From Swiss-Prot:
Residues 253-277 are annotated as: Interaction with MUC20. The gene is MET. It comes from Homo sapiens (Human). Changing V163I: In RCCP; germline mutation. The active site is at D147. The chain holds residues 1055 to 1344 of 1390 of the full protein. The lineage of its organism: Eukaryota, Metazoa, Chordata, Craniata, Vertebrata. This is Hepatocyte growth factor receptor.
Amino acid sequence: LSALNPELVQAVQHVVIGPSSLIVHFNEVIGRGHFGCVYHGTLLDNDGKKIHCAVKSLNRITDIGEVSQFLTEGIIMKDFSHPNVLSLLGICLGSPLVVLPYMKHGDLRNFIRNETHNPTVKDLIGFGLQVAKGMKYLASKKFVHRDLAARNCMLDEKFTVKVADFGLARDMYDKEYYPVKWMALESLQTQKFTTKSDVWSFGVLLWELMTRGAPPYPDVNTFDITVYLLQGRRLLQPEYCPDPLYEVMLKCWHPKAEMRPSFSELVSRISAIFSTF
Ligand SMILES: Fc1ccc(Cc2c[nH]c3ncc(-c4cnn(C5CCNCC5)c4)cc23)cc1
């Protein structure tokens, strides 16, 4: 710990949680191991109010070199706050900890897939507008997500969607042992990601929401996807999906990235479609 550069130690203090401020229960995991070593935690604020949080131990980090990068990951992600983006409550420096807020309803794809829950067409579009909002915030900060899908969005107690799976919340699904179908055609052809490829992915997420979490292109192999899209074939209009919203999904999948809507135009368009219910 004393090996760390003191200027960097100083720069990361506003992201660091003191040990006396956090209670981690290592005896109870969140989400039956499906998110790796994520535990129920209790974070205390300056007023001593208790915040129920999700604590992830970062086992991969073992040396002062990898520790330094992680401090910078915490510093950058701490400045990303928006109601539709999953926040970084803090970091704890026993492997380093990543303290995230608790999401009662877990991931979005699993929530919409669970037969017990019956969201309406309005609730679904409302989840899509929420994602679009978080994505609009990320695009304003020049942040490229690179892996947007319903499995990577979380749901809290007030059914507020949070864009996750980025920064210190990356590798969300690393269950240790004893995404071409969301990718833009140019991402598949050149391995380069932009806001314009995030929009293609958002279009897929919109289709996932309206099908209640059906897998895209079930009969197309991941190697065959490139040829399929080059022929100008796309995901079909889901059953209870309105024509204006399907027109939006198709605009998201245009072969020319520059012809695709921005997240601002998608927020604008989707909110006005949402308002018609
Ligand atoms: F580095 C990362 C570390 C952790 C994450 C995930 C994560 C963060 N906060 C969370 N809060 C709650 C849940 C969660 C999972 N399952 N559940 C319910 C579902 C409904 N049934 C009961 C169980 C709630 C997951 C998370 C991402 C990145």
